[PDB]
């Protein structure tokens, strides 16, 4: 068995390798990288996203979140609090000002001390879940907009024709900005391009051990547990490595930089946060290993998740016990 201890693995393919995602993508995994749910890909020194980021001031991030934080320094939630819209030009300096800016630090892992131990006492700004890309029509290889589509993965593997689209989103981050613990709606993979500014904080679980990761927020967050089957697709539960470690779940952890990509894999739990202000760019994707972890996805039908359109196929489709109760909780 290929990668049996579950490590991160980090990919350097040549620009030859670069042209056929899908294949990429199943080369990955015949080296073991999903055992760890996350693996990191590091373009070909002549390939780029786009020419330059000079021109990106004037998108609009029409609702920024604050992210507030309740609970202890290492076991928390977080809620979004909405604020008024600015543009990126706006959210940038704002990232910047004394009040929300990185400190000074000694290098990654003096930074992630930091983050553990003072996220909750401040309540960063994160400009999340923004439909649109910053590839360049023109760039053909790994180019997040021009992905095969679920809706046509899940007809070519199993013959069904289903509505929905599959397009990308930004995320502007600063400081502090945490992503909860979580899978990807359906348990699909997810890629991640950082396209500029500071790096990004990941942990995960592997894929083979997230039923350790549920059975500990159950324990962790008890009233929220009792509330929903599926509570952590409601996208709010931090618990920091060290309580993993204390709690003995396996997990591990990598930082992305500026440049790079990583990829999420089918039923990979994981968190992070951002060092300082940065852009991202986020997509799922699907692959024929994808249907059978589909068919298995836990869903959240307490009304909390409420997730996009395109769910609904997938769920109608693949888990149609589940469908009638699921759709309930999105209306
Ligand atoms: O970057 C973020 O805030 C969160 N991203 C992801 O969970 C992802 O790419 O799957
Ligand atoms: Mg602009
Ligand atoms: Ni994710
Ligand atoms: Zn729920």
């Given at each position: 068995a290929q990668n049996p201890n579950c490590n991160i693995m980090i990919f350097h393919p040549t620009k030859e390798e670069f042209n056929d995602f899908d294949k990429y993508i199943a080369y990955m995994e015949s080296q073991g990288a999903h055992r760890a749910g996350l693996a990191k890909i590091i373009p070909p020194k002549?390939?780029?996203?786009?020419?330059?980021?000079?021109?990106?001031?004037?998108?609009?991030?029409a609702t920024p979140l604050q992210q507030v934080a309740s609970g202890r320094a290492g076991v928390f939630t977080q809620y979004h609090k909405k604020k008024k819209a600015m543009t990126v030009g706006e959210y940038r300096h704002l990232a910047n000002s004394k009040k929300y800016q990185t400190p000074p630090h000694q290098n990654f892992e003096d930074l992630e001390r930091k983050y553990w131990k003072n996220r909750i006492y401040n309540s960063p700004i994160y400009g999340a879940?923004?439909?649109?890309?910053?590839?360049?029509?023109?760039?053909?290889?790994?180019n997040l907009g021009h992905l095969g589509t679920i809706q046509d993965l899940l007809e070519k593997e199993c013959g069904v024709v289903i509505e929905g689209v599959n397009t990308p989103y930004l995320y502007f981050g600063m400081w502090k900005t945490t992503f909860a613990w979580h899978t990807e709606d359906m348990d699909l993979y997810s890629i991640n391009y950082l396209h500029l500014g500071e790096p990004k904080t990941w942990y995960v679980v592997p894929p083979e051990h997230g039923q350790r990761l549920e059975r500990l927020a159950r324990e962790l967050f008890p009233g929220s547990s009792r509330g929903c089957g599926?509570?952590?697709?409601?996208?709010v539960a931090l618990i920091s490595p060290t309580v993993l470690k204390e709690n003995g779940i396996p997990f591990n952890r990598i930082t992305q930089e500026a440049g790079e990509f990583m990829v999420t894999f089918p039923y990979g739990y994981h968190a992070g946060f951002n060092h300082g202000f940065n852009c991202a760019e986020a997509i799922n994707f699907a692959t024929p290993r994808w249907i059978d972890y589909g068919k298995m996805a836990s869903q959240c039908?307490?009304?909390?998740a409420r997730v996009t359109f395109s769910m609904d196929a997938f769920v109608r489709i693949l888990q149609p016990e589940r469908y009638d109760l699921w759709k309930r909780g999105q209306d």
């Open positions: 002549e390939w780029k996203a786009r020419e330059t980021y000079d021109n990106i001031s004037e998108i609009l991030i879940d923004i439909s649109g890309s910053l590839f360049d029509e023109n760039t053909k290889q790994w599926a509570f952590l697709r409601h996208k039908s307490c009304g909390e």
